[PDB]
Design a protein around this ligand. Structure first.
Ligand SMILES: *[C@@H]1O[C@H](CO)[C@@H](O)[C@H](O)[C@H]1NC(C)=O
Length: 374
């Protein structure tokens, strides 16, 4: 809907700032997860800080009927098989919380703020890691490494997501082969390339800046979730040129302009485990003041003292491999055609989006720039 698209757009903007500052690195974020934590921050914000957040995000969770929308969204995504996701706010145990913040987090997120003794950073780390692990079924067992929290840490918003998908149609691992992937370096490296032929939802598009590109869709079993793979046509045009195609409306027009068509698709097998501290990106988006001791207004969290965000952290993890619906065939029925099936091989950096179709939410937005890394 309208506000789903606003969340998707806000999260893709964060994604687009992240890749702009690190064009050569593998990166997976969760637009849903990012909107979720900044939605938590909104519940605590007041005055100019609320106004700032609401204007950058495009909506306000403090407005009538909005907590129920956040809550149903969160409920629908978390209930997907394969999805383990956790968001929460961790606040120093010494701070006296306002009831309104408690009531807001319960109404929109069915959560409570988690009080942490940050004056003992290594204990705080173990407590936060165990909580995150318990709430992701162990899939994110050590959310934070040492050196992130300090004794000065007061308020942390975090989101953790692991996703184990099963393709509707399995890849045959016997069809997986070492083939060359071209990095932004110009260098070529040989990696396992999974391959399959099937009728694929497929479209060709051109960006605003006249860059020609394709998008191809691959469903997980159930078809509530599917991955969209997006890449420049020309092998020597960088992935960067596409950063601004990623909007919820552009995704809407991809879905109505795409049609099924036989294709031989080859894509690297890869895993990503991306940890990100979102300060630098959010500040590039104009949200720097939420981190400022002098300018941030979280009066809804506490009125007894100044308070600004210490950290906004996300960790996202997924493994993309051959696994498909058990006992299903890797291969279509043999239909003869004088039509040569076009090959699409993803042997240069590409975007991948993983979308929940009922809500339209993006569980992931990532770029693969080097398949041999996480
Ligand atoms: C590119 O630089 C050299 C080869 O040109 C290599 O050692 C390095 O790891 C490459 N980096 C990436 C990200 O492919």
């Amino acid at each position: 809907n309208l506000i789903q698209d606003k969340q998707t757009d806000f999260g893709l903007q964060v994604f687009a700032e992240a890749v702009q500052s690190a064009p050569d690195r593998n990166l997976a974020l969760s637009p849903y997860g990012i909107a979720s934590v900044l939605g938590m921050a909104q519940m605590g914000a007041y005055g100019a800080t609320l106004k700032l957040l609401a204007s950058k995000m495009g909506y306000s969770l403090q407005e009538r009927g909005m907590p129920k929308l956040q809550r149903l969204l969160q409920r629908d995504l978390a209930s997907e098989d394969g999805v383990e996701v956790a968001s929460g706010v961790m606040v120093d145990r010494k701070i006296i919380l306002e009831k309104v913040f408690r009531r807001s987090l319960s109404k929109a997120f069915q959560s409570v703020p988690h009080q942490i003794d940050f004056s003992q950073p290594e204990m705080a780390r173990q407590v936060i890691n165990s909580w995150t692990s318990d709430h992701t079924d162990g899939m994110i067992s050590e959310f934070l490494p040492s050196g992130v929290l300090s004794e000065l840490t007061r308020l942390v918003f975090l989101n953790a997501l692991h996703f184990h998908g099963v393709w509707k149609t399995p890849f045959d691992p016997r069809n997986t082969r070492e083939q060359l992937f071209h990095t932004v370096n110009g260098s070529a490296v040989s990696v396992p390339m999974m391959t399959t032929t099937q009728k694929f939802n497929y479209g060709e598009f051109v960006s605003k800046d006249g860059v020609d590109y394709d998008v191809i869709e691959m469903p997980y079993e159930g078809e509530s979730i599917s991955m969209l793979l997006v890449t420049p046509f020309e092998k020597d045009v960088p992935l960067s040129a596409l950063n601004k195609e990623l909007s919820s409306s552009r995704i809407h027009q991809w879905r109505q302009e795409m049609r099924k068509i036989s294709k031989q698709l080859s894509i690297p097998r890869f895993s990503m485990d991306t940890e990100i501290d979102l300060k630098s990106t959010l500040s590039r988006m104009g949200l720097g003041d939420i981190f400022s001791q002098s300018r941030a207004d979280f009066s809804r969290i506490t009125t007894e003292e100044p308070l600004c965000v210490s950290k906004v952290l996300q960790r996202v993890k997924l493994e993309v491999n051959e696994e498909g619906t058990k006992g299903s065939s890797a291969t279509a029925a043999v239909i003869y055609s004088r039509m040569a099936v076009e090959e699409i091989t993803l042997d240069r950096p590409f975007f991948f989006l993983i979308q929940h179709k009922p809500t339209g939410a993006l569980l992931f937005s990532g770029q693969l720039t080097q398949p041999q890394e996480y």
